[model samples]
Target: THSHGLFKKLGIPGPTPLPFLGNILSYHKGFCMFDMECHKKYGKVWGFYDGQQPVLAITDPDMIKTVLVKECYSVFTNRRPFGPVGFMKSAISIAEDEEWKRLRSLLSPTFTSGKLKEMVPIIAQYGDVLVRNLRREAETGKPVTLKDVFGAYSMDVITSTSFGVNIDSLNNPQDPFVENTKKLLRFDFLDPFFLSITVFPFLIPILEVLNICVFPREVTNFLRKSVKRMKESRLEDTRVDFLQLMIDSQNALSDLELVAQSIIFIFAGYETTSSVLSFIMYELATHPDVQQKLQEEIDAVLPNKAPPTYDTVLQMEYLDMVVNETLRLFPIAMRLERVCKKDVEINGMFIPKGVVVMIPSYALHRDPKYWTEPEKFLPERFSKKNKDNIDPYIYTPFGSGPRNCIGMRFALMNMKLALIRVLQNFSFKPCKETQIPLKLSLGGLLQPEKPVVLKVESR
Candidate 1:
């Protein structure tokens, strides 16, 4: 049987299934921390039949490479089975076709370097406040939570950049707006009942009859009112922030879409950026040698004379790798889902259109086949000398291809700016509660199970 018949017959990697739910037992797909276990047993390119559809969990770089880059993507419009889509009013990220392209083109220009550079002074201002607050915490020696600190910092960045408001989320940990915003980003999964309904988005009527809403109404209401407040307030000049763009978008967007866009930006920009910062601080704290080395570079750049700037940030190669390495380990959107738009041959299996393809980015990033020392904390892996060896698709923290994250520039800039400020004033020492070697929060996108603490030092 020329290379056996199972792969050809099943049209996926793994063995065949029993009945209706089909591969449903294959490691509760979205429960992230549990997900790595499945990949451990099943190698990279494997498949399972989920709900009558032959689904493929393509963790192999080459296969992931072919599907995302080589293949034509239209029908697969980055849509998938219902996961997390909280209060967002509905802009591009989850939208399909013309709507997706329209929103992409409309808002794409807002994220460019030219546009983002104008906010340098504003970023430095916030960075000072962020550092000063962290230094104060380090003074008390309470084992500061990097997760909490970065969360506060990133939310403030989003508030300033996206909403044209300066939030005290950084200094006052108990701020209501910050707390509510954090709550809204919660990745709370539904019970089995809701999961059953998600397996059938075609029957939303049944869900409505049961009075289930994937998006909480109160969360959406809060953000919508915030947007209105910003709109009613007078604008001084073109701040090159998201609020300006949203206000400028008045004639083109529906009220729902505008608020939805803010929620997505705030959610993605806030929590995800903080997640990256938290993990970066964790790696540096655990690897003190790397911490000192990066600190020297940080000192050289800012030289204790002034706050870090956009161009000074540009010269930060090792710092950049520190971020890249952290993202490699603790990627926020751990899983990337795209609905297959057409029949395409991936590896040996032919995936049909309308099929949902799960690209578990975390699984791919850590696969030993691609990385030499996948488990080790080594930023040098991303340095100019060795970076060429990295498999392109194997490291998609910001995603890949044209349909990738549009706000990636601002996300990176804000993350780098925050790290520089915090590290300059203090050093991180992980607390015992951090659950070293890590655990993911069950409900959130990609977060540590608890707030990671660090001992800070004013350099």
Candidate 2:
């Protein structure tokens, strides 16, 4: 009740709030739906409360540019606070101000074009393994759950590239590393501890002091110890993987900080890429013409069953369009937020300190004002001639500006490599189990409610 009048006083239009609970009840339908509904009713710039914390939800291109780009460094520096939560405290995603700058600067070189080019062979090896497994599955003529398939491939690539170790998760489904990672990312909205912290954010500091972690302790410990072991073993080895790069920068980061970066890389790299890959498969399966065009592009580039290099993959123009279209429809971080650091006015909208500026990427991507035939799966929107006419702020799959995803290139490379290998040998068709107009799971990440099953055939 204390901050209930803040939005009303600002004269911003939004759904009326309840005492204390604010708009928490409305989100039971999930962020994507809630945002769409709110945007429809209240127009572009609306206000909502997240447990008494005022949030300004904006879809206007100019305002988005101001928050995510123009004033990103000086005014909108940090995301919504989560206190000092576990090893993620030192992770670049959560670090603020000068700390973020330092970690970002040190880790930036690891994802550069030169370093990522060195990783092509590592990623391609796993892509080969994936194609082999799919070849066997294609023979069965049964529907394959692509999420699980790509999830394994993604795990294998992330582990090998980040830690310089082979997980082979596709073959060893019961691997401890894979199992623990599954547990770690299992997001439950109803977990009592998570709910308590959401309704009463004051508990964050108290929980931090008491060493009460929201993440499963067993999973965290397993990953931490695993990274620790890998770090210790690699001390004398001069490998060119991500872990070695961090180890080489020992002067800039502490031991725990090194472990933290490795863990974050695993956390960030694995599922998002896998989910996007799964969605792309779904879109292709549903739209065969687009798939055929993509296959032709792949064939044109690599004529003799050639292995794809960093440069060769970049040559497939149609593949880039397909990947971009899928990401536009399903941006993993459906909502991007920045906490206003100080009172600021951007394009006549008054934003106060501590207010969370939420940009519902799902809604923005589908908004008819920006995209033509917003619901249709048209990859041509991203074609060279057409894409130049599009605006960047409204189409942020990996976000935009300085604080965007650091692994943008790495993730794109992995996705494209896997797509090339699969498209080269196989094609996907919709099976009885494939969900038409896919039902999405209500979670932080954009995921299918059911496993994405499709008929895989040898090309």
Candidate 3:
């Protein structure tokens, strides 16, 4: 069996379970986000059957590149898709060959560094709003749930930046779109719900027949209206945004195609950026030293400025370190998945056609073979000299490939801008009631299970 060969190649040794349910029960214990404890004894790259779905968890940095970057298209296609299989068909995440090429080309230019710099002011404005809002909440001496606040802030920025339209989600915590966004882009769904759904697409239909649906119909309904409204209203005075790009973009594309990409942008831009920001705040609240070091750097850079500038973002090396270290620990895209488009063999394994391969990015980040204190939060590991010491494939919080995150530049810039402004004005140390060690959220994009209560005060 392919699973058998994988175990031998990777030298994984674990308790032999019953005929079925191989390690599936372990997932039930908690919201497991790629737990490495299960593979503590097993080598980084090992085998696991996610309910009979033969998955090879590759943790080796070299092999990660081999499958993801070097021999990417020949061996596989985009490893994951945004929605269920029915919804997966046209998604950018699953797009490959000509379709992938076309979509990526359209999406890539919108997120260039030059374009992001133009939007820095917009991103900062929203961050300021968040600080003001938090400042209001702090007057009562109540700890602000900074993670939730950041999520809303990121969603608003990314949506406005991408769509040239606003969802106004920053203030609306109970907005329908937020929950729907969480439902569709389930990070844990890949391991558990994905395993269940892939093995049983039939269950979806039955559940739908029972009228117990998962689409969160209202959100989709709202989006269809929201998109139409975004198209209808836009003054000539309005400057450019990603929504405008999608609207005016012409390269022999159709309305349906344009709309699909728009919806994808709405989801991707808001959700992924939101998740990253939330995760970084989680780590900062948990690890005070990282926060203090980052604060010192932020203070030095801003000096006497009430609000930090975009240039200040570039100068905050320690702040970047803090975020990078958090990303290393809890990456938004935890694993890289691809399908073998054609039969191929590498690393002494016959990866036949039509099978799936997973590069466990989270696992690789913690693998001792590649990282010296893999589990430890050490942003210095990404320092110039130290970063040059490691292979690029090992640390892929944002994945690696031509098809890597198209919005990576925008996400990075916005995070830096937000962190700079907020931290320069106030230090967000966690209150005692705040969840420690950061228990992950159940449905929302990998957030602290409990509110990230922070003691905010002037820096």
Candidate 4:
């Protein structure tokens, strides 16, 4: 897309891109290694073209710290374009400028430790269902598909905590809410149509005119209708849920935008946490020692309790290590992006206004400079003593800076409670169908290519 010597003229380094195509052909969606390979060839701060747009790809922790944290307030205020306000309004991640600030402030309190503590019961309410579902699979003498199990469990939690809707998806496999969300969440960014829209931002209006949508209309209706129902059910009687909290805030966002928050909650909450939980379970199945260590920690924390309280679960140091290590290995957002609002210079590299700076999290996590034996999973690396050697910005799974994943605390609490409860009564083992050294999915998220078949037994 650029004339010859464009990036070189600007003193930026990157792989050469062809005319019109830019680097489109080489780009692999949902692929972290592609970005990692780019970083390897071009060094820390390099330039790449996202269609006509020149994006500065950054993996260096120090530069990343500057862009996302230091300059986050003034210079880097928005994410890359995700179409108009209609589609963007529902997405906190894609929300721009002042809207992002307001939405973030309005929803920030929902994830506080105190708020999460209050919602602990709502989170644990699905524990029995999770156990029962697994118990059935375990009794059947067949390999259990934990992808589906955790998906259902997480789906239940997000729905219950957000809208007080009990969608027992594990028991009712055909449940409409579960079915619809599955459809809505299906995103294949590598597909040509999607790739075109992403690479060429100008085509968004043309696609919109033709009613072409990355998100299906059916999925849109389901989320909107659910929000309508929640508003209708809003009463003088207090309710302790995400919807109630937002309603109480009486924030600037319209009722529809309020509904959009719930959609964000459902999509964001259920998917990432479930993926991590599945990965953790798979890791535990393969590494019996780690599993036992985790079980021992859980036992010490709860002993004979059926369900541990939030305070007790918080004290499980080993459990925290396992989760943190899991995230280090598999951050769902493989890369992070911030659009430079104004030209800013850092360490001799000049970042111009409107240039999108990418933080290749997956690559940074595996970099030999930051981690030892990056290929292997070792929870001890996160132990308090060893953790001091690492920079907080380098090991960001939830992301870095003020605009990091807002739901992180809530997500962590959900993961901790579920892992503790499940581990208290059961241990995971490989089944005949198990994929040793689990095959990774090159889909929207980094997940197992197929359902991980783990044999679960009563502890």
Candidate 5:
């Protein structure tokens, strides 16, 4: 309860806190709704508690730019160091300071245009498989849960591109690779152990010593072992995948570091990319006019229904708009968190060292001041002419600044290729099971509470 008065002392306003639980219990409906409510009630800047931890929420674009970009390295160089354990400790997502710099520099080239271009064939192949699978589902006249379909495709793309191994999860949904990876995505915020660690940070060290992790241990081990096997088998292989790149980094990375990077690749890439894809599909299904416009663009670009090349997908402006809009609507990572490394004041707001700074991206994206008809699905918001009128800081789906999502370009390419291929052959319509106003769950990611079921028909 000693931590309860920090926000009051700081002169920041937010919902009242309760003992050790703080304001954590108030957001049971989900951070998406909670963030919007708080933003409305407390204006651009507010403070809240995740248990005893004080979180400063800033929605002002200029202040966000200062934190995430201008003073990133000096003031907010790292994300909040929560519960990454074992091999996960070395993963780039959680690595801090010099170690993060080393890993990031070494891994940056793996997602370059040249490397991503080489992976085009791999993604296109999986996209075709997705279309084929969905075509069969369409023939059955049943509503297909898009998350399951896209989850399979995303896994196939990640495994093949990252490790040079094809689990072909689209065809084999029950595969251990699919099963274990799914296990990794099951983040329960209400879990007793999770609550214990969040409410009492001191216990994290004890939990770490006990090898009790937030992530599912069996899944982590399965992925770690799988990466090890792939690494050993590819000792002499000259593949152009992410794993191969890390292995070929000479002595830059240790053996365990290689496994850590590979596993994190799957962890970071799979669910996030697939969730976006599913959301895009749902949007296309609900907004038939928007879907038609996108399909027309796809048709004109790939008149012969050719497999989407890296160059071709890039040329479709409307496709880019559609994807950008979808990302804006459901910016995964509802709140982007960064820990203060040094005491800093930006826009007259003093943030002390060690406190967490959160940018509620979901709420920021839909802020009426920054967006016209923020709730509407209008791809023109990102149109070449219109986009220039918008401020870049407020529209950070991939985040902003130095430590943003590193695999952004690769994820965009994967999404564009899949959309091109699928839209070229099929059209989506709302089925009875489709939720008109999508109901999202309470979590870090903006995920549909129910399956995103839509009807797919051959064009």
Candidate 6:
């Protein structure tokens, strides 16, 4: 394939790949940081092969808007293939064409502002427990791991909200669901076999013919068993959580399909939001001025120490900016991937069908042109005075347009609730154990490589 120089024919620049293996070695070794490095070396648009398949990595804001929001969105609707077919097929994130539409329409109403408002009480209850737990940890005067605590907190909130049952992992870390679900999202997508299939899409069919599933059996079996237990309990008849709404949506799906949706909901709902919460807390601990300002905003909204209502949280403008800033700095899905179904022209070059395109969010969010002090944590960039000056496409924390995260509103609500509760009762102090410069995870979700350790001081 390299003999003809397909990328050179299109005038695209990229790292040269070895025959057959292509660019898998770089990703397999360095993970996502390699994407940033590639951009740094090759500029905005560069061609990089994954095994045999060619991928175009684009970071130009105009080009990004064209691919992500405008122009040929329908052509690039599908995500980069991972966790192959015959599995996670029912997940909205993975669903394609008509199935994607059906799932999106079915699940959309469940995440509306009104539905999230109704779910606030459920989140608030757990937020209270989180504050109490932090208080105990703080009074001990020992460093506490914020990510682990928030993971547990997110587990409690998402489980109750998604399934209408309380696993309460925050209070009971030994819950079976904790370990099972953790393993589900924590798989290594960069493994050799997985990377090969992902980069070279044609291998998917042969693997499927052999009855190989892309989704891990461990994850699938655990989710299938959970749905079976829920069915056996017959609680599907009651409550108005996401699962209940999915059932009531009347989508023609099997028990297994419903199980897939439930698992996706819980994983998508909690993991990213919880990681954001952890980062926000860590930033607050490191930046005393930002924390104090945010706390003052929270206190002003809830002077009587009442649990924050949805409207009250919405009214906290400063809290909103702080969350926006954190997301800009540490977006969960650092690079958004999409595949083209038909040929499309971008930046005077023809991007043919089957080509994968990646928008490097980490690079874009930290670009000096888009941000005043790209490396600094200044929430004021999102403040009322400065936010309007920033382009919408440049700082899309939850992405943009129709295919953006469905759980954006719900995620924001849960994040703000936890912050409000914790900030009201305790102050995050940077402990000696805190990493001076946060070390991010090598791959997958954008999270601290080390546990975020800080001292929680009761106000």
In terms of lDDT, the best-performing candidate is 2
Give the poorly placed runs of model 1, Cα more than 4 Å off. Answer: 1-8, 15-18, 28-44, 50-53, 59-62, 70-73, 81-89, 185-194, 197-205, 208-211, 234-240, 346-349, 442-444
Q: Model 6, range 399-452, lDDT digits (tens) per residue?
A: 776788888888888888888988889888887888989988765567687878
Q: Candidate 3's residue-wise lDDT over 66-145, tens digit each?
A: 88888876666556332343333455665667788777776677877678777887776788788777777766777776
Clash pairs detected, candidate 3: 79-337, 79-338
Please give the distance, in angstroms, between residue 155's alpha carbon in candidate 2 and its true position after superposition.
1.4
Clashing pairs in 5: none
Better of 1 and 6 by TM-score: 6
Tens-place lDDT per residue, model 5, 1-459, is 987898899889989999888888876777788889999999989999988899999988899999999988788888876763766899898899889989988888888898889899888778889988989998988888887888888889998988788877888867788668766644656655555566668887777788877667888778777887988778854466677678668548887788778878887778888888999999998899999998888878888786788898889999999999988888988888889988888898789988899999989889988888999999998998898888788888888888988999998988888888888889998978789899787754578889788888897
TM-score of 5: 0.96
Instruction: Tell me the whole-model lDDT of each prediction, alpha carbons only.
Output: 0.71, 0.85, 0.66, 0.79, 0.84, 0.78
> Per-candidate RMSD vs. true structure?
3.8, 1.5, 3.8, 2.0, 1.6, 2.4
- TM-score per prediction, in order, is 0.89, 0.97, 0.85, 0.95, 0.96, 0.93
Candidate 2 weakest ten by summed lDDT: 185-194
TM-score of 1: 0.89
TM-score attained by model 4: 0.95
Clash pairs (backbone) in predicted model 4: none
Q: How close is candidate 6 to the true structure, as a TM-score?
A: 0.93
The reply for model 4, stretches above 4 Å from the true place, is 3-5, 28-30, 83-85, 88-90, 236-240, 249-251
What's model 4's lDDT at 378? Answer: 95
